[PDB]
């Protein structure tokens, strides 16, 4: 039913994969090697010439966040009403912004900018700690009483930053208990421990 | 009912403003000067320390695309069903990606990178021409049979690029007729000609 076409890395597919796994959904991984990509055919066929590419039946989607919102809508991980939907988006857009900065660091200037980035990290993470503190004392999910696609995206963002800068969550008790709690969810826990996840690099240039 | 808190520029609020105007909605513009911003209070109160800030009743939102999707949901500019909603997102995410590149050029290296950017423009615009060609011959809207929040965002993206690189749409007949057509919509036409729009700079550093 579901098919994700992507390079052999976690990157922009980690979140949607966690979502599918934690939601007990089944999907096909179509791995695209750098050689196959350099060939040019596939790329030229991609709407924006990039991956991931997602297939739900004959519905073909591009853009990682479009995929997340699509699954969020179809799997009921988008809040209970319009107001909640807006809050979920607000969280996901914030996650996306930080992911872009992370991606820029990793691929553009890991060596030179890693110091400043880590220094500015606390200020970038604080918003999510604040969101949690304003939602049932940070005991449930990021913004509503049920898990949303934004939670999976946030969870990944947090996991990869703990690798980039160990202990970055030590200053944020809600985020820490949040990561621990969500990572404990049965299907998600099993997935995160699987080779399918563990044996794929976070990024494509060996940096993390 | 609606209130947009932003700097005195079109920037990331141009699209939502066109949407509100074309939809016959009323809103309050709360202008934030650079001096008021440098003061720090407001910024510290912003979820991600940035503007725009949007208020719909006591619902406070941040993130321009969250605002667009919120209005799209509440005003019925998000398609008719889930599949269409996904297609609308796919378009908006593409617009967002190019906007980010545009924003980087304008604020990061207008002088040095303007040449390469313009050179790469055609390849960045082509995806939208393609989207139009696959939707009722490009006679209606960007992806579905009704206007969506993504249309307004795309329209703005196109308008500002024609300023950055005059004639960039000459190679794309569907996009051209698209811009002309949407700009002709009564309420939108009146808005675009108003001082409210015309007398605000596109960006904040005087570059365009
Ligand atoms: N906004 C897109 C970004 C997609 C993207 O950056 N794709 C990269 C891999 S992470 C890619 O296809 N790189 C190869 C290329 O551009 O040819 C999304 O969120 O899906
Ligand atoms: N992802 C955000 C980006 C917001 C943004 O870049 N805001 C700028 C002005 S357009 C800002 O607040 N700059 C001041 C600062 O960050 O200190 C959105 O789409 O709204």
Nearest to A71 by CA among A113, A16, A130: A16
Whether residue B170 contacts residue B177, with contact meaning beta carbons closer than 8 Å, is answered with no
CA distance to A15, A72, A132, A166, B198, per residue, from A205 (Å)? 19, 30, 33, 20, 45
* Structure-block tokens of residue B33: 């000067």
In whole angstroms, give the CA distance from residue A34 to residue B187: 49
CA B128 to chain centre: 14
How many degrees, rounded to 5, is the angle at CA B175 between CA B173 and CA B177? 70
Phi, psi of A24 (to 5 degrees): 65, 30
Nearest to B165 by CA among B174, B173, B155, B157: B157
Rounded Cα distance between B134 and B144, Å, is: 10
Asked whether A73 and B156 are in contact (CB, 8 A), the reply is: no
Atom number of ligand 2 nearest to Cα B51: 12
| Residue A89 DSSP SS3 | helix
Phi/psi of residue A161, nearest 5 degrees: -80, -30
The two tokens of residue B8 are: 């005195």
Q: Give the HSE-up count for residue B156: Cα atoms under 13 Å, Cβ half-sphere.
A: 27
**DSSP 8-class letter at A172:** -
Method: X-ray
Side-chain-side CA neighbours of A192 within 13 Å: the count stands at 19
Helical (H) or strand (E) element with A132: helix A110-133
**Are A71 and A13 in contact, with CB atoms under 8 Å apart?**
no
**Beta-carbon contacts of residue B126 (< 8 Å; ≥ 6 apart):** B172
Structure tokens, A57: 């039946």
CA distance A46 to B14: 29
d(CA A29, CA A15): 14
Residues with Cβ within 8 Å of B91's Cβ and at least 6 positions away in sequence, in order, are B128, B131, B142, B143, B148, B150, B154
* Cis amide bond preceding A73, omega within 30: no
The pair phi, psi for residue A51, each rounded to 5°, is: -115, 165
Q: What is the distance between the alpha carbons of residues A196 and A199, in angstroms, rounded to a whole number?
A: 6
User: Which ligand 1 atom is at minimum distance from the Cα of A52?
Assistant: 20
- Burial of B3 from C-beta contacts in 10 A (0-12 / 13-18 / 19+): middle
Point out the residue among A63, A69, A97 whose CB comes nearest to the CB of B48.
Answer: A97
Tokens representing residue A14 in the block:
């980690």
Residues A135-143: contacts with CB within 8 Å, 24+ apart?
Answer: A138/A174, A138/A177, A138/A178, A142/A91, A142/A178, A143/A79, A143/A84, A143/A87, A143/A88, A143/A90, A143/A91
Tell me the backbone φ, ψ of residue B9, rounded to 5 degrees: -150, 165
Say whether A49 sits in a helix, a strand or coil.
coil
**Rounded Cα–Cα distance for residues A115 and A117 (Å):** 5
Protein residue with least CA distance to atom 11, ligand 1: A50
**Cβ-contact B85, A65 below 8 angstroms:** no
Tracing tokens 């303007």 back to the chain, one arrives at B114
Residues of B in contact with A65 (CB under 8 A): 89, 93
**Chain B contact present for A126, CB below 8 A:** no
Is B83 touching A (CB cutoff 8 A)?
yes
The pair phi, psi for residue B27, each rounded to 5°, is: -150, 165
Per the CB < 8 A criterion, the answer to whether A51 and A9 are in contact is no
B70 close contact with A: CB closer than 8 A: yes
Class of domain B78-185: mainly alpha
Comparing CA positions, the residue from A92, A68, A72, A51 lying closest to residue A146 is: A72
All residues of chain A having their beta carbon less than 8 Å from the beta carbon of residue B85 are 69-70, 73
C-alpha R_g of chain B = 17
A89 with B69: Cβ contact below 8 A? yes
Q: Which two tokens stand for residue B56?
A: 């719909």
| Whole-angstrom distance, CA of residue A62 vs CA of residue A42 | 13
To test the pocket of ligand 2, the residue of B13, B38, B51 to mutate (highest count of ligand atoms within 8 Å of its CB) is: B51
- Asked if residue A47 lies in contact with residue B127, where contact means CB atoms within 8 angstroms, the answer is yes
Distances (CA, A) of A99 to A132, A158, B77, B121: 19, 10, 28, 24
Q: Which residues, including other chains, have CB under 8 Å from residue B186's CB and lie 6 or more apart? A: none
Concatenated DSSP letters of chain B: -EEEEE-SS-GGGHHHHHHHHHTT--EEEEE--HHHHHT-HHHHHSTTS-S-EEEETTEEEESHHHHHHHHHHHTT-S-SSHHHHHHHHHHHHHHHHHHHHHHHHHHH-HHHHHHHHHHHHHHHHHHHHHHHHTSGGGTS-SSSSS--HHHHHHHHHHHHHHHHSTTTTTT-HHHHHHHHHHHHSHHHHHHHHSHHHHTS-SSSSS--
Which residues have CB under 8 Å from A161's CB, separation 6+?
A: A102, A121, A125, A168, A169
**Does residue A52's CB lie within 6 angstroms of at least one atom of ligand 1?**
yes
Candidates 3.40.30.10, 2.60.15.10, 3.40.50.620, 3.30.420.40; CATH matching A1-77+186-207: 3.40.30.10
* B39 close to ligand 1 (CB < 6 Angstrom): no
Give the ligand with the smallest distance to the CA of B99. Answer: 2
Euclidean distance between CA atoms B87 and B80, whole angstroms: 11
Q: Is A42 exposed, middle or buried (0-12, 13-18, 19+ CB in 10 A)?
A: middle
**Cβ(A102)–Cβ(A125) below 8 Å:** no
Domains B1-77+186-207 and B78-185 share a fold: no
- Annotated domain spans of chain B: 1-77+186-207, 78-185
Q: Collapsing DSSP states into helix, strand and coil, what is residue A206? A: coil
Give just the sign of the alpha carbon dihedral B173, B175, B177, B179.
negative
CA distance A99 to A153: 9
In sign, the C-alpha dihedral spanning A101, A107, A108, A112 is positive
Does B146 appear as a known binding residue?
no
For residue A153, the Cα-to-chain-centroid distance in whole angstroms is: 3
Let me know: does A11 contact A205? Beta carbons within 8 Å.
no
Chain A CB within 8 Å of residue B59 CB: yes
The set of residues, in sequence order, having a beta carbon less than 8 Å from that of A88 and lying 6+ positions away, is: A72, A78, A79, A143, A144, A148, A149, A150
């Amino acid at each position: 039913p579901y098919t994700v076409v992507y390079f052999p890395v976690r990157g922009r597919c980690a979140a949607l994969r966690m979502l599918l796994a934690d939601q007990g959904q089944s999907w096909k991984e179509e791995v695209v090697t750098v050689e196959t990509w350099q060939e040019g055919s596939l790329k030229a066929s991609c709407l924006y010439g990039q991956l991931p590419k997602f297939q739900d039946g004959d519905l073909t989607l591009y853009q990682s966040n479009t995929i997340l919102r699509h699954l969020g809508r179809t799997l009921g991980l988008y809040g209970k009403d319009q107001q909640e939907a807006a809050l979920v988006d607000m969280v996901n857009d914030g996650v996306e912004d930080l992911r872009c900065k992370y991606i820029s660091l990793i691929y553009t200037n890991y060596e030179a900018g890693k110091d400043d980035y880590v220094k500015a990290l606390p200020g970038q993470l604080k918003p999510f700690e604040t969101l949690l503190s304003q939602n049932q004392g940070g005991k449930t999910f990021i913004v509503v009483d049920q898990i949303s696609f934004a939670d999976y995206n946030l969870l990944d963002l947090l996991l990869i930053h703990e690798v980039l800068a160990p202990g970055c969550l030590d200053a944020f008790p809600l985020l820490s208990a949040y990561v621990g709690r969500l990572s404990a969810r049965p299907k998600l826990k099993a997935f995160l421990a699987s080779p399918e996840y563990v044996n794929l690099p976070i990024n494509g240039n060996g940096k993390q």
